[PDB]
């Protein structure tokens, strides 16, 4: 695997694997967004749906030319979560924390 592919897998795994101070894996809610059949209202609040399974499949299909492209999908996903849920909710706070982890991970790989 190229250094580019190694950095992509590392960024993805940092987000996926992060746990909080009590061991809770924050990424669990962001793996699979329910379909529009199951969750119509989300697809009207949210222009471009995104979840980690989609990011993972783009990564296995090498569709990421650089790291910036992967971060954009992650930031899109976390912005989506912070649009659909209110700031006081757990999912909003989990999105904010994983967003910070994402950027700190990209920075550490600079
Ligand atoms: C019972 C039924 C009505 C089907 O609802 C559910 O099963 N839900 C579970 C998922 N849930 C949410 C997912 C995301 C989310 C997921 C992946 C990526 C980004 C995201 O924002 N965000 N906010 C939510 N609150 C919506 C409600």
GROMACS .gro file of C-alpha atoms and ligand atoms in nm:
model
  137
    1UNK     CA    1   0.000   0.000   0.000
    2UNK     CA    2   0.115   0.350  -0.098
    3UNK     CA    3   0.188   0.608   0.174
    4UNK     CA    4  -0.131   0.778   0.052
    5UNK     CA    5  -0.338   0.463   0.107
    6UNK     CA    6  -0.168   0.414   0.444
    7UNK     CA    7  -0.264   0.765   0.552
    8UNK     CA    8  -0.625   0.718   0.435
    9UNK     CA    9  -0.667   0.392   0.626
   10UNK     CA   10  -0.508   0.552   0.932
   11UNK     CA   11  -0.741   0.854   0.930
   12UNK     CA   12  -1.046   0.629   0.884
   13UNK     CA   13  -0.936   0.397   1.165
   14UNK     CA   14  -0.869   0.689   1.402
   15UNK     CA   15  -1.231   0.800   1.368
   16UNK     CA   16  -1.378   0.449   1.364
   17UNK     CA   17  -1.179   0.327   1.665
   18UNK     CA   18  -1.192   0.631   1.896
   19UNK     CA   19  -1.343   0.568   2.238
   20UNK     CA   20  -1.425   0.823   2.507
   21UNK     CA   21  -1.294   0.823   2.865
   22UNK     CA   22  -1.540   0.550   2.961
   23UNK     CA   23  -1.451   0.327   2.664
   24UNK     CA   24  -1.754   0.414   2.447
   25UNK     CA   25  -1.700   0.389   2.070
   26UNK     CA   26  -1.848   0.714   1.937
   27UNK     CA   27  -1.847   0.606   1.572
   28UNK     CA   28  -2.121   0.345   1.623
   29UNK     CA   29  -2.408   0.580   1.531
   30UNK     CA   30  -2.230   0.700   1.212
   31UNK     CA   31  -2.161   0.363   1.046
   32UNK     CA   32  -2.494   0.320   0.866
   33UNK     CA   33  -2.746   0.593   0.797
   34UNK     CA   34  -3.101   0.449   0.774
   35UNK     CA   35  -3.252   0.444   0.426
   36UNK     CA   36  -3.490   0.716   0.309
   37UNK     CA   37  -3.771   0.462   0.347
   38UNK     CA   38  -3.689   0.419   0.715
   39UNK     CA   39  -3.599   0.784   0.782
   40UNK     CA   40  -3.758   1.020   0.529
   41UNK     CA   41  -3.723   1.340   0.731
   42UNK     CA   42  -3.342   1.316   0.739
   43UNK     CA   43  -3.312   1.322   0.362
   44UNK     CA   44  -3.503   1.650   0.351
   45UNK     CA   45  -3.294   1.818   0.623
   46UNK     CA   46  -2.971   1.699   0.460
   47UNK     CA   47  -2.856   1.781   0.108
   48UNK     CA   48  -2.598   1.501   0.063
   49UNK     CA   49  -2.623   1.199   0.297
   50UNK     CA   50  -2.303   1.036   0.413
   51UNK     CA   51  -2.199   0.759   0.651
   52UNK     CA   52  -1.883   0.575   0.740
   53UNK     CA   53  -1.976   0.262   0.541
   54UNK     CA   54  -1.992   0.481   0.230
   55UNK     CA   55  -1.658   0.642   0.319
   56UNK     CA   56  -1.513   0.294   0.377
   57UNK     CA   57  -1.636   0.168   0.038
   58UNK     CA   58  -1.489   0.470  -0.143
   59UNK     CA   59  -1.161   0.396   0.036
   60UNK     CA   60  -1.155   0.026  -0.057
   61UNK     CA   61  -1.228   0.139  -0.415
   62UNK     CA   62  -0.927   0.378  -0.393
   63UNK     CA   63  -1.164   0.661  -0.494
   64UNK     CA   64  -0.968   0.897  -0.263
   65UNK     CA   65  -0.694   1.080  -0.452
   66UNK     CA   66  -0.565   1.257  -0.138
   67UNK     CA   67  -0.643   1.290   0.231
   68UNK     CA   68  -0.837   1.616   0.186
   69UNK     CA   69  -1.104   1.429  -0.012
   70UNK     CA   70  -1.165   1.182   0.273
   71UNK     CA   71  -1.177   1.456   0.538
   72UNK     CA   72  -1.435   1.644   0.329
   73UNK     CA   73  -1.668   1.342   0.336
   74UNK     CA   74  -1.615   1.306   0.713
   75UNK     CA   75  -1.673   1.679   0.777
   76UNK     CA   76  -1.981   1.658   0.556
   77UNK     CA   77  -2.105   1.365   0.765
   78UNK     CA   78  -2.043   1.541   1.095
   79UNK     CA   79  -2.199   1.866   0.974
   80UNK     CA   80  -2.498   1.658   0.866
   81UNK     CA   81  -2.536   1.509   1.213
   82UNK     CA   82  -2.508   1.856   1.370
   83UNK     CA   83  -2.782   1.980   1.135
   84UNK     CA   84  -3.030   1.701   1.206
   85UNK     CA   85  -2.985   1.683   1.588
   86UNK     CA   86  -2.991   1.969   1.841
   87UNK     CA   87  -2.671   2.086   2.017
   88UNK     CA   88  -2.768   1.939   2.354
   89UNK     CA   89  -2.809   1.588   2.212
   90UNK     CA   90  -2.557   1.305   2.247
   91UNK     CA   91  -2.526   1.252   1.870
   92UNK     CA   92  -2.441   1.621   1.814
   93UNK     CA   93  -2.176   1.608   2.088
   94UNK     CA   94  -2.040   1.277   1.955
   95UNK     CA   95  -2.016   1.434   1.608
   96UNK     CA   96  -1.828   1.735   1.750
   97UNK     CA   97  -1.580   1.508   1.929
   98UNK     CA   98  -1.515   1.279   1.630
   99UNK     CA   99  -1.475   1.589   1.413
  100UNK     CA  100  -1.201   1.710   1.649
  101UNK     CA  101  -1.039   1.363   1.645
  102UNK     CA  102  -1.045   1.367   1.264
  103UNK     CA  103  -0.864   1.700   1.237
  104UNK     CA  104  -0.614   1.611   1.511
  105UNK     CA  105  -0.540   1.286   1.327
  106UNK     CA  106  -0.483   1.461   0.993
  107UNK     CA  107  -0.262   1.718   1.166
  108UNK     CA  108  -0.051   1.451   1.338
  109UNK     CA  109   0.015   1.285   1.001
  110UNK     CA  110   0.144   1.609   0.845
  111LIG     C1  111  -3.611   0.423   1.441
  111LIG     C2  112  -3.586   0.511   1.320
  111LIG     C3  113  -3.700   0.610   1.301
  111LIG     C4  114  -3.564   0.429   1.194
  111LIG     O1  115  -3.465   0.594   1.344
  111LIG     C5  116  -3.344   0.538   1.362
  111LIG     O2  117  -3.319   0.420   1.357
  111LIG     N1  118  -3.251   0.633   1.383
  111LIG     C6  119  -3.111   0.596   1.410
  111LIG     C7  120  -3.015   0.685   1.335
  111LIG     N2  121  -3.043   0.825   1.365
  111LIG     C8  122  -2.943   0.918   1.333
  111LIG     C9  123  -2.838   0.890   1.245
  111LIG    C10  124  -2.751   0.995   1.213
  111LIG    C11  125  -2.636   0.977   1.120
  111LIG    C12  126  -2.593   0.849   1.085
  111LIG    C13  127  -2.487   0.831   0.999
  111LIG    C14  128  -2.421   0.940   0.946
  111LIG    C15  129  -2.462   1.068   0.978
  111LIG    C16  130  -2.569   1.087   1.065
  111LIG     O3  131  -2.610   1.214   1.092
  111LIG     N3  132  -2.766   1.117   1.264
  111LIG     N4  133  -2.866   1.144   1.350
  111LIG    C17  134  -2.952   1.049   1.387
  111LIG     N5  135  -3.039   1.083   1.484
  111LIG    C18  136  -3.178   0.858   1.319
  111LIG    C19  137  -3.280   0.776   1.396
   0.00000   0.00000   0.00000
